[PDB]
Design a protein around this motif. Structure first.
Motif, PDB file in Angstrom:
ATOM      1  N   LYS A  32       0.860  -1.075  -0.053  1.00  0.00           N
ATOM      2  CA  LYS A  32      -0.052   0.075   0.003  1.00  0.00           C
ATOM      3  C   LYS A  32       1.000   1.217   0.019  1.00  0.00           C
ATOM      4  O   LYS A  32       1.919   1.361   0.618  1.00  0.00           O
ATOM      5  N   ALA A  33       0.640   2.355  -0.741  1.00  0.00           N
ATOM      6  CA  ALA A  33       1.230   3.662  -0.616  1.00  0.00           C
ATOM      7  C   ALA A  33       0.198   4.705  -1.117  1.00  0.00           C
ATOM      8  O   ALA A  33      -0.732   4.399  -1.778  1.00  0.00           O
ATOM      9  N   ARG A  34       0.561   5.689  -0.835  1.00  0.00           N
ATOM     10  CA  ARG A  34      -0.102   7.145  -0.968  1.00  0.00           C
ATOM     11  C   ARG A  34       0.704   8.201  -1.707  1.00  0.00           C
ATOM     12  O   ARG A  34       2.095   8.310  -1.458  1.00  0.00           O
ATOM     13  N   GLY A  35       0.154   9.081  -2.408  1.00  0.00           N
ATOM     14  CA  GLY A  35       0.576  10.235  -3.015  1.00  0.00           C
ATOM     15  C   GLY A  35       2.113   9.698  -3.657  1.00  0.00           C
ATOM     16  O   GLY A  35       2.062   8.984  -4.610  1.00  0.00           O
ATOM     17  N   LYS A  36       2.832  10.386  -3.513  1.00  0.00           N
ATOM     18  CA  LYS A  36       4.258  10.262  -4.300  1.00  0.00           C
ATOM     19  C   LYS A  36       5.160   8.889  -4.116  1.00  0.00           C
ATOM     20  O   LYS A  36       5.900   8.649  -4.761  1.00  0.00           O
ATOM     21  N   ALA A  37       4.617   8.114  -2.891  1.00  0.00           N
ATOM     22  CA  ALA A  37       5.248   7.058  -2.656  1.00  0.00           C
ATOM     23  C   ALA A  37       4.465   5.929  -3.853  1.00  0.00           C
ATOM     24  O   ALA A  37       5.070   4.576  -3.616  1.00  0.00           O
ATOM     25  N   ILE A  38       3.364   6.268  -4.282  1.00  0.00           N
ATOM     26  CA  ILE A  38       2.904   5.257  -5.195  1.00  0.00           C
ATOM     27  C   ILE A  38       3.541   4.579  -6.492  1.00  0.00           C
ATOM     28  O   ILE A  38       3.819   3.613  -6.683  1.00  0.00           O
ATOM     29  N   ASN A  39       4.611   5.674  -6.821  1.00  0.00           N
ATOM     30  CA  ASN A  39       5.743   5.271  -7.968  1.00  0.00           C
ATOM     31  C   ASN A  39       6.820   4.270  -7.209  1.00  0.00           C
ATOM     32  O   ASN A  39       7.096   3.260  -7.927  1.00  0.00           O
ATOM     33  N   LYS A  40       7.019   4.415  -5.920  1.00  0.00           N
ATOM     34  CA  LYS A  40       7.986   3.500  -5.286  1.00  0.00           C
ATOM     35  C   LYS A  40       7.238   2.050  -4.883  1.00  0.00           C
ATOM     36  O   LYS A  40       8.009   1.001  -5.054  1.00  0.00           O
ATOM     37  N   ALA A  41       5.990   2.069  -4.808  1.00  0.00           N
ATOM     38  CA  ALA A  41       5.316   0.921  -4.575  1.00  0.00           C
ATOM     39  C   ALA A  41       5.289  -0.078  -5.982  1.00  0.00           C
ATOM     40  O   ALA A  41       5.444  -1.048  -5.767  1.00  0.00           O
ATOM     41  N   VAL A  42       5.232   0.897  -7.087  1.00  0.00           N
ATOM     42  CA  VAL A  42       5.173  -0.126  -8.203  1.00  0.00           C
ATOM     43  C   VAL A  42       6.908  -0.649  -8.347  1.00  0.00           C
ATOM     44  O   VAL A  42       6.766  -1.500  -8.869  1.00  0.00           O
ATOM     45  N   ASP A  43       7.696   0.276  -8.060  1.00  0.00           N
ATOM     46  CA  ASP A  43       8.978  -0.150  -8.377  1.00  0.00           C
ATOM     47  C   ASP A  43       9.435  -1.421  -7.531  1.00  0.00           C
ATOM     48  O   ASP A  43      10.026  -2.242  -7.833  1.00  0.00           O
ATOM     49  N   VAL A  44       8.984  -1.293  -6.382  1.00  0.00           N
ATOM     50  CA  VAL A  44       9.013  -2.474  -5.199  1.00  0.00           C
ATOM     51  C   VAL A  44       8.302  -3.717  -5.976  1.00  0.00           C
ATOM     52  O   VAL A  44       9.083  -4.726  -5.855  1.00  0.00           O
ATOM     53  N   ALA A  45       7.138  -3.526  -6.418  1.00  0.00           N
ATOM     54  CA  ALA A  45       6.583  -4.964  -6.901  1.00  0.00           C
ATOM     55  C   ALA A  45       7.177  -5.213  -7.985  1.00  0.00           C
ATOM     56  O   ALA A  45       7.149  -6.612  -8.283  1.00  0.00           O
ATOM     57  N   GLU A  46       7.508  -4.270  -8.967  1.00  0.00           N
ATOM     58  CA  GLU A  46       8.210  -4.792 -10.045  1.00  0.00           C
ATOM     59  C   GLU A  46       9.520  -5.402  -9.820  1.00  0.00           C
ATOM     60  O   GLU A  46      10.029  -6.413 -10.514  1.00  0.00           O
ATOM     61  N   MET A  47      10.234  -5.014  -8.819  1.00  0.00           N
ATOM     62  CA  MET A  47      11.672  -5.640  -8.749  1.00  0.00           C
ATOM     63  C   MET A  47      11.364  -7.117  -8.351  1.00  0.00           C
ATOM     64  O   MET A  47      12.000  -7.999  -8.346  1.00  0.00           O
ATOM     65  N   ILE A  48      10.267  -7.128  -7.200  1.00  0.00           N
ATOM     66  CA  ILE A  48      10.106  -8.658  -6.738  1.00  0.00           C
ATOM     67  C   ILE A  48       9.878  -9.521  -7.917  1.00  0.00           C
ATOM     68  O   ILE A  48      10.344 -10.712  -8.199  1.00  0.00           O
ATOM     69  N   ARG A  49       8.856  -9.016  -8.869  1.00  0.00           N
ATOM     70  CA  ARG A  49       8.413  -9.688 -10.065  1.00  0.00           C
ATOM     71  C   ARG A  49       9.571  -9.935 -11.046  1.00  0.00           C
ATOM     72  O   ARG A  49       9.740 -11.249 -11.712  1.00  0.00           O
TER      73      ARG A  49
END
Length: 80
Positions: A32-49
């Motif tokens: 979960k993430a809000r505001g500007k951290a949303i792009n970091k949440a996607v970075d994290v999920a993409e890295m795991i994947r």
């Protein structure tokens, strides 16, 4: 403990490790993430994947708004 990882201001790698930690006891993890951290949440999920659990599936992605000011939110559910 639940299976949620709140993405905030910490460096991306810290959350990558937190997600790996949750994935050791759960087959599903909620990022979960809000505001500007949303792009970091996607970075994290993409890295795991991309680099750690290549077989990982994205079970659900949901966006919304939280709160006198609105802020966008994202929730990404990763599942093995």
């Amino acid at each position: 403990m639940d299976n949620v990882v709140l993405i905030g201001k910490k460096p991306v790698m810290n959350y990558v490790v937190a997600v790996l930690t949750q994935l050791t006891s759960n087959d599903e993890v909620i990022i979960k993430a809000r505001g500007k951290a949303i792009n970091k949440a996607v970075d994290v999920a993409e890295m795991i994947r991309n680099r750690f659990i290549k077989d990982i599936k994205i079970k659900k992605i949901e966006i919304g708004t939280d709160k006198e000011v609105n802020v966008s939110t994202i929730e990404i559910v990763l599942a093995k």
